[PDB]
Design a protein around this nucleic acid. Sequence first.
DNA 1: GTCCCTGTTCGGGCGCCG
DNA 2: GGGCGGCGCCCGAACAGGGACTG
Lengths: 392, 548
Amino acid sequence: ETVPVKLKPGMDGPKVKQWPLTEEKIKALVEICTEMEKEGKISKIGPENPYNTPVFAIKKKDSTKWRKLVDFRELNKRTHPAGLKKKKSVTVLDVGDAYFSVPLDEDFRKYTAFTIPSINNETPGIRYQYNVLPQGWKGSPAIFQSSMTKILEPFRKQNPDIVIYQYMDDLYVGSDLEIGQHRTKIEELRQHLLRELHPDKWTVQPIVLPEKDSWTVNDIQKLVGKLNWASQIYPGIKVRQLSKLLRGTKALTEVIPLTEEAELELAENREILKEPVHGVYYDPSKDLIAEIQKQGQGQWTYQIYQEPFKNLKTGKYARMRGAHTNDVKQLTEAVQKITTESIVIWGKTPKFKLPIQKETWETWWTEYWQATWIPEWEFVNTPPLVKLWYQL
Amino acid sequence: PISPIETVPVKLKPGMDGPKVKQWPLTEEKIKALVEICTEMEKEGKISKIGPENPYNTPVFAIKKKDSTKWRKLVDFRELNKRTQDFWEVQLGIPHPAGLKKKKSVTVLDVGDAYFSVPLDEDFRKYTAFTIPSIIRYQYNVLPQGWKGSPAIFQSSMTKILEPFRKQNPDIVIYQYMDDLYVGSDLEIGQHRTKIEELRQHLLRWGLTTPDKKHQKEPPFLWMGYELHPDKWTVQPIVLPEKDSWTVNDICKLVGKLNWASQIYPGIKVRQLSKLLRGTKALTEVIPLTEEAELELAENREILKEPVHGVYYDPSKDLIAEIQKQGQGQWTYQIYQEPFKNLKTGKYARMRGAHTNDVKQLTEAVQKITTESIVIWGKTPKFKLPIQKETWETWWTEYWQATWIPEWEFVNTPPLVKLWYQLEKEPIVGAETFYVDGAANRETKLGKAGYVTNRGRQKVVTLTDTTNQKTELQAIYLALQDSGLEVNIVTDSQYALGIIQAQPDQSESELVNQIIEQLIKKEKVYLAWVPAHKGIGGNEQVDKLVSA
DNA sequence: GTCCCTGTTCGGGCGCCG
DNA sequence: GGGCGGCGCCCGAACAGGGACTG
Ligand SMILES: Nc1ccn([C@H]2C[C@H](O)[C@@H](COP(=O)(O)OP(=O)(O)OP(=O)(O)O)O2)c(=O)n1
Ligand SMILES: [Mg+2]
Ligand SMILES: [Mg+2]
């Protein structure tokens, strides 16, 4: 028995061109889709359906199984346990298969259309649409929620110190058990479901001022720039006595001895930068914005905010130092780690301002993607100023 | 015949009604061609006579079929196309011969009267009304030519029709462009011919004939604009217009033929030719060739006078793309597997950004080639690039964006891609320090650019018809002019800093180009930033200077 | 806000195929 | 001679986003 679903008023469905796939992805998509057709989960359709969302496939590590991934970002556009972030361990199970057990409202099926391409355009695209709740669609958890609650009730009763949160296709299972017993309980839940993160140890990356015992005109100019910018986040910051040392027209490499007043100003400012940002309240009706800066040598900084200079979080991701590193691969893993953090803390994905060229990103990001959701993003060409301000 | 395949349901856009458009005058030649076509189509039920209960009409014409003495019937369905529902096109790209593999046996088949063999939705037929004038009125029961739905409906129907044959014959390869079939197989010529008979009998069961006249059995095969020989392929000859006075239409024709040519001809360049089209107002306007365009066109002509072919794809070998730099942000490339046997060639010339350099452009060319290789062969190629691993490493360190090139290897064919100057990370001891600024008045458009230096020098230049950003750039240009081989510059301008930090070697801005000349002549430059209007350093002094 | 600069998209010509 | 869809190229027009500015 079906559940009617409509589009937001004044909105038509998605018309998004499919991008080129590699041979391995097309072969996996064709085999997966053939089985899905044999089981009634999808139906071939024609060009009289004017809708389309792109499709690709990811091969999970430690597994020769491919998983299909429909980018439902547009379609989703057009349609919380605060104790999970504190748990010792949190496992992330993939429960997407459950959705294929529930039919989809007939009048909605047309909007889930997708096209499989072919190598060297041997054939026109093969088009399908969904007959069941598709993985990666905003409506799938919503419509399945009641069956999910019935499925999880007795396991939650028998384990009240365990937190089970659902996001799009994933279960987050949080516990304070030791790692072996945690994995035992997770397999207990996997067995029950036939009807590895560690969030307590995530780090804020504060803004830091340089420490040294000889300052030049350049050093002080750079520090005044950084503090002037930072005072938009922390109003306590003050630059009068530091910029007083810069009067005149001096050489960049001239050594400037700090006065008593300016030394106090600097120590007070570096204290102020420890206090937490005042007046930052999460709004669920606005979206999270995540900025990322490439700091170099495998280091990346990021800030999650909703209004400018009111950061909900500020962090850094580190990776392999630069022997044979891949900037785009690392940027992608950084995006997934940030999205995971944001889903766990606020239950919502951020919109990323990515410091990469549109084309470089779209050429390569699907070779390193391992999640079942995809966040929104836009592309950016920042001044190196914000880079310096968050740098270490 | 007419295919017994199910029709594709088609609707008009809500609130719209069929077209009512008078028929044109036609020549007697076109009338005779149309009546010969329509008598036969009506006999076969592909069209039906209609009466006064059908209040619609759309004009018709014919054209000689391009490679025959036979006619093609076309309808000017522009109004109906405006009023017809949207489709999702299923033809995602164009097959390329460099993506075909070696086959024992090859056949090329054309379907006869392709659109006219595929039924059209019953309910929609009435809006296809047309009139053959006198010396008769009809409606289409099949797909017409000129309707926007016919390509997609045909391509999808043909896919459906071929699916059972493909399921039964997985290891027979059928490249399916509209009604063109290239069929390849690893069978001896005998079993192959038997399977081609099976395929023609399958198609005929579904209403599609394969007349012998277009059944190609022996090489070279004429396919998709190419000549396919057993172990090599070529392009059917390109003929460039050879006029004396050139118009925008002639130029577009030239540039289009040259772009088509560059897929197998190495070295094609169209920059100066394309630049000719810059300020045009209409297709008919006459443009005199620049000396640069003249010479470029002669070079392209010489290139095209040469005999050249591609080869087919061996999956058990690597794809190698090799890139060569031409001037003005122009690049050619060659994709091959064995040393002097190109799979195909190409050119990249897109101008991306007001300001850029050759490492950015080469990264863009790599990206383009990678996406094109994924489309044609399904994998990424290994690269041979004219850029030192050291140069790339330097750029990738200094640059603030994520950037990356796949597996690659240096190649020593000049001109090599280099960074032409490097900003210091730390200020320069013993270099004079310039504090620069510019101000511009938004009402009068007058400005000043200027500097003050720590050794006492101060200079202010006045500018007309300028802007804030331009005065900032002008001040930096003034400091570069008036300094020695090593210089520290302090600016309050995020604009100028972001530009110069990214190390451009080319710009559409004359002023930025002049700056670049200067920065290449210098030995050490250090560019520092301070926030404006906070009373910092000599920034206050030069700010008080350039305001008046 | 306005003016400026820059990047993306989309539509128009032409090429090529059918 | 004209009509259609796909892909390609190049160009310019429209629009979006961010920095600098005036009293
Ligand atoms: N200039 C063209 C060429 C082709 N087509 C479409 C309609 C054609 O029917 C189909 C295939 O092209 P053909 O030249 O093969 O046309 P036919 O199949 O009708 O002719 P024939 O029987 O000679 O093959 O593609 C078109 O609309 N305009
Ligand atoms: Mg034909
Ligand atoms: Mg200024």
